[PDB]
Amino acid sequence: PETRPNHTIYINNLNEKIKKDELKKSLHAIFSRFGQILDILVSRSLKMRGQAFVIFKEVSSATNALRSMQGFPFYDKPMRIQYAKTDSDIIAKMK
Template identity: 60%
Template sequence: MDLRPSCTIYINNLNDKIHKEELKRSLYELFSQFGHILDIVAMKTMKMRGQAFIIFKEISSANVAMRALNGYPFYDKPMRIQYSKKESEVISRMRGTFVEKGGKKKRPEDEEANKQKKKKTNKPGDKGQRAMNGEVSVPRMEMSTAAPSRQQQAAEQQVPHHILFLSNLPDETNDIMLSMLFNQFPGFKEVRLVPGRSDIAFVEFDTDSHAVPAREALQGFKITTTHAMQIDYSKK
């Protein structure tokens, strides 16, 4: 059964021997080139081992990431990627469609009203006393995994690198075709295709400065009438 397109993608068949924080960091580095990531959820419980959820801000980003990396070898195991069956809570809250467990839709204006009500009813020191009595839960301190702002992400993408990442390539793409395009630029070294994936590839130059004019000249180049090549600098 085909799942509806979603901002959240579900990944399984991940290497469960990788430490959780390293896994999340590596997933972010790999998937952030496709769009703004709001959150990455990965847990090491028995039920969730080898699985993760990546929440993009835009459905289009999730779609491109899924098409580009489904089956991509990640820590020696091919990833299996599909849309998540349920919309993530962070997306629901952004859209104002979040529904609490009781079944009541919680609107942003309702949350603000509740905050104001709590300010009026809670006296200084009340919360601490109630927490000691077990009447309220004390929030746990957790490390933030929030993605960088759009401005920070854009700045990172503009940092030149001697390796270029190509995406949105047509199925008939091969290394000879790409070499003919890029070897006209000084410093060209090689084209590296991804096994089993014809829509993405890497092109390496001798130096960062050699890669810059190639990216600028061929950005958006249409190998076919329906595929405009997307070129990004690889992460340093």
């Protein structure tokens, strides 16, 4: 069951050996060109490792980042991007 467009893009299949701080840094490095980023959430917990939530200010950016970077080799692995099932709080607190 696919997901509907969202301000936030959910990414997984990310190299799990990368420290949280760097992963956010590097993600920002390759995603900032698609639009203003409000935040990037990463957690190395058993359940949230290898995944990340890039929160774009404008949905169009999210869509671009999704179409263009899908499959992109990052830290030796192909990035698998989707739209986040639900809105991130940062977005809720506005729209």
